[PDB]
C-alpha cells in the first residue's frame, strides 16, 4: 500500500542523510583541536562518508567545539539560521554542553543550547576523539529513526 511505498522512499532519503552529512566544526577551544585529532588518519570520519566542509550553506551538521562567550554568541546563532535545513548541532565538550569549567564566569553562556537547539550532547573535557566519533554515530542512528515522509502521509 501507500504506507509501504512511503516507508521505502523515506528510507532511501534516510540512507543519504545518515551517510552524507557534511559536518562543520566551529573551532573554538581545545575541543576543536580535539576534533582535529579525529581528522587524523587514526579515525578518518571521511571513511564514514562525512567530510569537513566550510561555507555553512553547504554543510548539514555543525559542531560547536569549545567554550561559548557572549561575544561569540550572536555570530554563532546567526550562522545557524543560514545553515540550510535539515540542520543539526552537536555539543562537544563540557564547556559547550553546560559551560563546564567556565560555567560561572561573567563572559560565558552556560551551555550552547541556550543559543541553538542541540541535537546530540557529547560529554567530555575534552571528549576523546572516538567518543565524539561515537556521538556522530548516534546522530546517524537518530537520523535513521525519522518519519518525515510517514508524518506527512498521516498529516
Amino acid at each position: 500500500r501507500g504506507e509501504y511505498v512511503v516507508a521505502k522512499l523515506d528510507d532511501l532519503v534516510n540512507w543519504a542523510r545518515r551517510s552524507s552529512l557534511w559536518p562543520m566544526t566551529f573551532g573554538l577551544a581545545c575541543c576543536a583541536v580535539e576534533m582535529m585529532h579525529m581528522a587524523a588518519p587514526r579515525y578518518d570520519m571521511d571513511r564514514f562518508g562525512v567530510v569537513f566542509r566550510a561555507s555553512p550553506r553547504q554543510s548539514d551538521v555543525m559542531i560547536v567545539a569549545g567554550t561559548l562567550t557572549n561575544k561569540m554568541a550572536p555570530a554563532l546563532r546567526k550562522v545557524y539560521d543560514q545553515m540550510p535545513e535539515p540542520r543539526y548541532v552537536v555539543s562537544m565538550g563540557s564547556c559547550a554542553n553546560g559551560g563546564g569549567y567556565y560555567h560561572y564566569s561573567y563572559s560565558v553562556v552556560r551551555g550552547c543550547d541556550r543559543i541553538v537547539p542541540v541535537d546530540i550532547y557529547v560529554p567530555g573535557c575534552p571528549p576523546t576523539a572516538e567518543a565524539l566519533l561515537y556521538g556522530i554515530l548516534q546522530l546517524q542512528r537518530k537520523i535513521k529513526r525519522e518519519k518525515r515522509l510517514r508524518i506527512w502521509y498521516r498529516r
Binding site: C30, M72, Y104, Y106
Partner: protein, 284 residues
C-alpha cells in the same frame, strides 16, 4: 557659468576610493573559528589590520581568585590548549618558587621530558596547520598520526588525552607506567624520519617558499620592543632562549642547539621550528 580654471586643472572631487573594511572571521576557516580580524584594503593591498580579540575571552584569572592553587592548576591546561604540559610547568615552577620548595630530581626530569614532548606536540600543529592554511593539506594527517602517539603517551601517564593535570606544584602527580620509556623510545627513533618527511615535502618546494620567504619580515629591534618572544625573536636573529639563558628545572644539565635564523621573515621561523623539532628530539 564660471570661467575655466587658469591652470586647466579643475579641482578634484571628494575621495572616490575606500579601504573596504572587511570582517574576516569567525566562521571563516582561516580564522581558527574564533577570530574577528578587521582590516583596510587598497585593492589587494592592506593598510591596517585590527585583530579584534575577545571571541574566546573567559574569566580564567577572575575565577583563579576563587579557586585554590590545586583547583587552579587545570586552568593552565586549557590556556594554551596545544601545549598542555608546558603551561602547568610555568604554574608549578611559580608556585613552588613561592613555597621555597624544590621538586625531587626524578620529578624534574619527568617535567623536561614531557615539556619537550609537549614541544613536539605544539610545533607539529604550528607548522602543519600553517601548511593547511598555506594550501597543501596532506602534512596535517601526515603528522597527526604521530600526534596521536604521544597523545597515547599522555593517556598512559596522566590518564587523560589532552588535559593531563600532571605537572603539579611539588613535582608530578603520579609515576609513569612500567615500560612507558620503551614505547616513547620507539616513537623517538621513527619520529626523525617523519621530520625528514616534512622537510622533503615543504622546505625545497618553490610554492611553499614563495608563499613564505621574504614575507612578514621584522627587524631585531622592533621584534624585541614589540614584546615578542621565542621563535618570533629567534627567527629575526635575536640571540635569546629561556632554556639556555635562564635554565629552569633540569634544563641546565642538557645541551641543545638553538636554531637562530638570520632573515626574520616567515621562512626563517619555519626552518627555526623544524630544527627545534630535531633539537627537541635531542632532549628526549
Amino acid at each position: 557659468w564660471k570661467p575655466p580654471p587658469w591652470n586647466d586643472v579643475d579641482p578634484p572631487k571628494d575621495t572616490l576610493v575606500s579601504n573596504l573594511t572587511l570582517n574576516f572571521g569567525p566562521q571563516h576557516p582561516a580564522a581558527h573559528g574564533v577570530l574577528r580580524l578587521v582590516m583596510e584594503l587598497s585593492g589587494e593591498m592592506v593598510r591596517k589590520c585590527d585583530p579584534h580579540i575577545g571571541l574566546l575571552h573567559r574569566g580564567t584569572e577572575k575565577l583563579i581568585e576563587y579557586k585554590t592553587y590545586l583547583q587552579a592548576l587545570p586552568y593552565f591546561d586549557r590556556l594554551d590548549y596545544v601545549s598542555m604540559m608546558c603551561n602547568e610547568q610555568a604554574y608549578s615552577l611559580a608556585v613552588e618558587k613561592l613555597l621555597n620548595i624544590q621538586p625531587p630530581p626524578r620529578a624534574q626530569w619527568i617535567r623536561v621530558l614531557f615539556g619537550e614532548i609537549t614541544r613536539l606536540l605544539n610545533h607539529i600543529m604550528a607548522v602543519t596547520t600553517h601548511a593547511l592554511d598555506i594550501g597543501a593539506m596532506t602534512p596535517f594527517f601526515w603528522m597527526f598520526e604521530e600526534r596521536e602517539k604521544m597523545f597515547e603517551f599522555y593517556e598512559r601517564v596522566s590518564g587523560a588525552r589532552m588535559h593531563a593535570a600532571y605537572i603539579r606544584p611539588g613535582g608530578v602527580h603520579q609515576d609513569l607506567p612500567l615500560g612507558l620509556l620503551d614505547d616513547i623510545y620507539e616513537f623517538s627513533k621513527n619520529f626523525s624520519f617523519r621530520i625528514d618527511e616534512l622537510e622533503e615535502m615543504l622546505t625545497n618546494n618553490r610554492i611553499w617558499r614563495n608563499r613564505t620567504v621574504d614575507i612578514g619580515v621584522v627587524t631585531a629591534e622592533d621584534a624585541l620592543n614589540y614584546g615578542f618572544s621565542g621563535v618570533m625573536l629567534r627567527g629575526s636573529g635575536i640571540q635569546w632562549d629561556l632554556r639556555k639563558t635562564q635554565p629552569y628545572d633540569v634544563y641546565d644539565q642538557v645541551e641543545f642547539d638553538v636554531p637562530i635564523g638570520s632573515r626574520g621573515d616567515c621562512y626563517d621561523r619555519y626552518l627555526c621550528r623544524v630544527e627545534e623539532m630535531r633539537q627537541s628530539l635531542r632532549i628526549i
